[PDB]
Amino acid sequence: ALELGRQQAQLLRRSVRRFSTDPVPGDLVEAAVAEALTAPAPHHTRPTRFVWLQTPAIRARLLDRMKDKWRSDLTSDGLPADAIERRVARGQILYDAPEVVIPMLVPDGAHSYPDAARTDAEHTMFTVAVGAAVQALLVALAVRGLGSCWIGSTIFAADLVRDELDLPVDWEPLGAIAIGYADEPSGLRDPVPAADLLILK
Amino acid sequence: RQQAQLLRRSVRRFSTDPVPGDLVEAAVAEALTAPAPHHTRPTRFVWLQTPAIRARLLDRMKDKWRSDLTSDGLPADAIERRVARGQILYDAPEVVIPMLVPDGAHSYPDAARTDAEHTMFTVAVGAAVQALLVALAVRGLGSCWIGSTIFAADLVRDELDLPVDWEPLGAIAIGYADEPSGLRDPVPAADLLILK
Ligand SMILES: Cc1cc2nc3c(=O)[nH]c(=O)nc-3n(C[C@H](O)[C@H](O)[C@H](O)COP(=O)(O)O)c2cc1C
Numbered sequence: 001a002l003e004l005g006r007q008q009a010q011l012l013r014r015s016v017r018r019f020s021t022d023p024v025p026g027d028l029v030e031a032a033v034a035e036a037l038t039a040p041a042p043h044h045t046r047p048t049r050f051v052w053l054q055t056p057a058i059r060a061r062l063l064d065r066m067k068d069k070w071r072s073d074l075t076s077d078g079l080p081a082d083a084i085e086r087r088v089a090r091g092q093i094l095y096d097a098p099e100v101v102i103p104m105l106v107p108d109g110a111h112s113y114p115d116a117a118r119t120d121a122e123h124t125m126f127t128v129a130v131g132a133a134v135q136a137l138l139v140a141l142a143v144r145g146l147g148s149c150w151i152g153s154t155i156f157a158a159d160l161v162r163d164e165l166d167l168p169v170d171w172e173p174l175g176a177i178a179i180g181y182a183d184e185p186s187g188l189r190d191p192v193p194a195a196d197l198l199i200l201k
Numbered sequence: 202r203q204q205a206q207l208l209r210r211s212v213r214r215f216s217t218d219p220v221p222g223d224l225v226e227a228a229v230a231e232a233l234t235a236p237a238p239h240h241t242r243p244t245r246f247v248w249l250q251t252p253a254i255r256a257r258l259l260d261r262m263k264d265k266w267r268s269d270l271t272s273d274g275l276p277a278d279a280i281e282r283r284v285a286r287g288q289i290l291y292d293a294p295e296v297v298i299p300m301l302v303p304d305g306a307h308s309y310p311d312a313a314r315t316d317a318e319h320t321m322f323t324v325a326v327g328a329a330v331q332a333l334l335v336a337l338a339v340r341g342l343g344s345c346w347i348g349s350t351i352f353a354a355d356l357v358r359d360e361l362d363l364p365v366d367w368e369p370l371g372a373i374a375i376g377y378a379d380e381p382s383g384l385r386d387p388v389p390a391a392d393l394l395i396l397k
């Protein structure tokens with residue numbers, strides 16, 4: 001059971017888009033976030049912050065301001081009205097989701113370099129670390145019976161997130177995580193072989 | 202299940218036991234279960250099996266480091282101490298390089314949304330890396346993520362004959378831990394979890 005339990009974890013993780021209306025224990029969120037932070041991070045750094053959007057008027061106003069920017073940006077692009085609203089409808093999950101947690105990059109412990117190349121490299125390294133912390137959260141949720149779906153939208157509206165949530169300039173949003181009990185039971189995924197995604201040299 | 206992610210430690214000393222290849226393969230299949238934006242495949246894992254190529258790529262990385270850190274004005278002392286921290290990639294039984302590839306990237310005319318898309322693909326690869334280190338661990342195999350290839354991307358592309366838009370996102374040293382470790386027991390998030 002201990003062997004198996006070890007083997008099962010990451011295969012319970014699906015991108016869940018339809019949530020039942022069962023409230024989420026606060027404690028599972030908190031514990032799952034604690035597990036998430038076992039992900040690796042460069043030494044003497046803390047790249048990841050998780051920003052849990054508990055106040056519904058705050059969640060809501062951030063999402064409306066995002067929606068608004070989306071329509072005007074997609075309109076500049078010359079997309080037709082219907083197509084814009086199709087896209088915008090993709091964001092409805094963040095409105096209805098039982099919980100929402102924004103992962104953010106912060107350059108805590110970042111090394112400082114004089115040149116642009118190594119400064120970008122450093123920010124990249126920090127970016128993949130937050131990426132690792134997000135996977136570890138989705139899996140921590142999934143093993144506590146909780147579904148989730150990573151929505152990348154805040155990445156395209158960093159200034160609006162920062163302004164709305166009153167965060168300093170160097171906090172960088174890396175999406176949004178919708179969290180809830182899935183409306184439909186889902187089994188274990190049976191992953192496929194790596195095939196062309198693994199390259200031998 | 203409570204176990205899996207807690208077996209994952211950054212391990213820096215491996216035994217001489219060889220690593221069965223089918224575990225590296227199966228573990229990469231599991232890593233790619235990580236989420237990815239729709240109709241994209243941001244991640245490639247590049248396994249350095251050919252020892253001459255590994256030795257040759259690290260050697261050029263070592264040279265680039267020495268030459269750079271000397272530009273910065275570090276003392277020979279401190280330089281040798283820092284570069285010796287890359288010995289692990291020489292010694293590790295296996296080395297896998299995760300790489301970002303813009304496969305299925307949506308196209309934008311402006312730099313702002315272009316960068317956002319690149320950032321989106323970058324975090325997806327990170328998630329896949331975590332998924333790998335866990336997948337390995339749950340098959341009783343240690344690993345360590347080393348960031349260095351991110352700082353020598355041109356060298357890595359040159360040396361591995363990869364195209365210009367393959368971006369290395371470190372290197373994962375893999376082997377059986379020389380000393381076993383206890384499970385992790387994570388501390389609560391405290392100030393890293395912000396409530397709004
Ligand atoms: C992006 C990234 C780069 C890293 N680069 C290095 C490295 O160059 N050398 C090294 O020894 N460890 C490296 N690590 C491993 C971290 O040092 C390690 O995660 C940290 O010391 C905490 O250990 P833990 O993973 O055992 O929780 C890296 C981790 C990440 C996420």
Ligand SMILES: Cc1cc2nc3c(=O)[nH]c(=O)nc-3n(C[C@H](O)[C@H](O)[C@H](O)COP(=O)(O)O)c2cc1C
Nearest residue numbers: 014015150151152153235236237238239321324325
């Ligand atoms: C960086 C990132 C951004 C994402 N953004 C979205 C999104 O805006 N909408 C969405 O439905 N799913 C999003 N996803 C989830 C993927 O669509 C999902 O992983 C894919 O449908 C199938 O994988 P899964 O069901 O195995 O997770 C995102 C994933 C990542 C890594």
